[PDB]
Design an enzyme around this catalytic site. Sequence first.
Site, mmCIF file in Angstrom:
data_model
loop_
_atom_site.group_PDB
_atom_site.id
_atom_site.type_symbol
_atom_site.label_atom_id
_atom_site.label_comp_id
_atom_site.label_asym_id
_atom_site.label_seq_id
_atom_site.Cartn_x
_atom_site.Cartn_y
_atom_site.Cartn_z
ATOM 1 N N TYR A 24 1.208 0.971 -9.313
ATOM 2 C CA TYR A 24 1.263 -0.056 -8.361
ATOM 3 C C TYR A 24 2.591 -0.917 -8.581
ATOM 4 O O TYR A 24 2.961 -1.219 -9.936
ATOM 5 C CB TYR A 24 0.039 -1.079 -8.581
ATOM 6 N N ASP A 27 -12.445 -2.160 5.632
ATOM 7 C CA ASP A 27 -12.743 -1.179 4.713
ATOM 8 C C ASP A 27 -13.973 -1.628 3.750
ATOM 9 O O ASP A 27 -14.059 -0.993 2.521
ATOM 10 C CB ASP A 27 -11.532 -0.878 3.869
ATOM 11 N N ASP A 36 -7.359 -7.812 0.213
ATOM 12 C CA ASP A 36 -6.361 -7.488 -0.669
ATOM 13 C C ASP A 36 -5.101 -8.453 -0.927
ATOM 14 O O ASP A 36 -4.732 -8.883 -0.071
ATOM 15 C CB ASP A 36 -5.838 -5.977 -0.707
ATOM 16 N N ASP A 96 -6.947 -2.883 6.690
ATOM 17 C CA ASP A 96 -6.707 -3.088 5.292
ATOM 18 C C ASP A 96 -5.692 -4.243 4.814
ATOM 19 O O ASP A 96 -4.693 -3.731 4.391
ATOM 20 C CB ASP A 96 -6.424 -1.899 4.646
#
Lengths: 282, 282
Positions: free
Chosen positions: B89, B115, B120, B152
């Site tokens: 990441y 989702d 996020d 998302d």
Amino acid sequence: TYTTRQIGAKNTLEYKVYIEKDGKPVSAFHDIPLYADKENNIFNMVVEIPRWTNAKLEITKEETLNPIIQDTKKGKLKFVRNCFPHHGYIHNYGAFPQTWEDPNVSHPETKAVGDNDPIDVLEIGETIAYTGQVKQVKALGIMALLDEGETDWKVIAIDINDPLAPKLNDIEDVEKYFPGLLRATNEWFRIYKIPDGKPENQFAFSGEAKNKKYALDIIKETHDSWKQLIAGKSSDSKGIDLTNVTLPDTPTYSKAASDAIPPASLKADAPIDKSIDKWFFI
Amino acid sequence: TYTTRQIGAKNTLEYKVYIEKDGKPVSAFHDIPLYADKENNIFNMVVEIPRWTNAKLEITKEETLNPIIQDTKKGKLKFVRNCFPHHGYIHNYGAFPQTWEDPNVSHPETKAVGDNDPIDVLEIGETIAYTGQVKQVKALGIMALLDEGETDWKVIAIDINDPLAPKLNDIEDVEKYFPGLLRATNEWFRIYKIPDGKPENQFAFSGEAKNKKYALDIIKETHDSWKQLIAGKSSDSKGIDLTNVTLPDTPTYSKAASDAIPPASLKADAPIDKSIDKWFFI
Ligand SMILES: [Mn+2]
Ligand SMILES: [Mn+2]
Ligand SMILES: [Mn+2]
Ligand SMILES: [Mn+2]
Ligand SMILES: [Mn+2]
Ligand SMILES: [Mn+2]
């Protein structure tokens, strides 16, 4: 069979990694044969820095049997900074033993004196290497890096155990299977020292990665320079420790050097200063 | 003060990280306030995945108090692969508690259902975060990712403690101080599952990173979605464990759930399969 003997904890000033041959410490610089297979040009590569780590570990020219130790900066450990979009070193970084970038003479291809160190190797396989590892590699090509004005060739190679080894045979194959890696390599070596206040580095040939044939010629040249060095025939060995335990006809041959090395004293990795986390946008 | 309670070793199926509030475990999903300072737009971010790591750790929806655990696929630990030039990441990755991407309604901006996970957050600061860490961040912008066809959103944020925090106010400042990061972020989210055999993802608005005001609006919507969820008013909560220890007026409030959590049993990290080293050039 090559193994490692670790003294101390990684990321500390006491940390040292000696390379052993059948349990006995040997010089990582002089005692490891350049070729694993001379006929097939398979080289022995000594790994110093695993991919994605930051510590500037190196075969030390100043200590007996040249163990791999971390370089220092102002009394503390030296680390390369993270330069976006890269994390630490982007290759398993090392050198070929029995080679030397002669610092006494100017190299014609680059018009600069060598950096006084064994020739450098960038191992591009998928598996992350370990410090002190001796892996067998195929030469694919070479880049003419001028690091802070010094000849500093970077050989591009691949571990013969890599799943893709059979398909990588010359420099063009790197762009075919690892698209973008060569451009990123050129970039990384140009800018990695900028966070440390050094100027951007430069490459001869406009940064072109020369092919295998070319690479082999330069590798041979650096092996010849090391032959002169280890024979005590350099005009100036720059205080490099030339002690070895496998070359009986050299002036610095001394088997007892191997027995003088302290036993392994492995300790778990020590914490690394959080400042090393920083990503530089340069 | 928020601390962490670790069960087992990292990189194992038994690994769990609970977030403690004054030494007592609380739900990482429901009990941590979204706002640290509402009117100044400061949020509490729950970190799941530190920058440059591969394990797909997440606040688990189906365990009481929602500890962070590693996601799995076909009974095996789930790891994100390295996609050149990226290593794991490329941000300190996490989420905002008390938010929910509603999977029961098609989102108009993206034309897809959510989702089923809290919103996020991509924290771009210099320091590498730790799993289970609760840090205060500023929202700078947001990207509309469609991950395998599901809404998302990815909030771009900065730890308020970061040296650059005072100079980062809106999305444009990210390009100024972190040149190339937004572009690399778009790339990362588009290609990261390709090594797993999945299609390239897509972004709404041609990948444009919307500003701080836009980001605040989406964050607030997902906060409202969570308010319906926690009140027990969703048409389908998908088996999400809504047990909480700080919201007395909710149907799933339980002042016994905290003491039911086992004590810390932190073990050293377990080894990660060497295949995770592989750098994919896709
Ligand atoms: Mn070197
Ligand atoms: Mn150099
Ligand atoms: Mn060098
Ligand atoms: Mn998430
Ligand atoms: Mn997703
Ligand atoms: Mn999500």
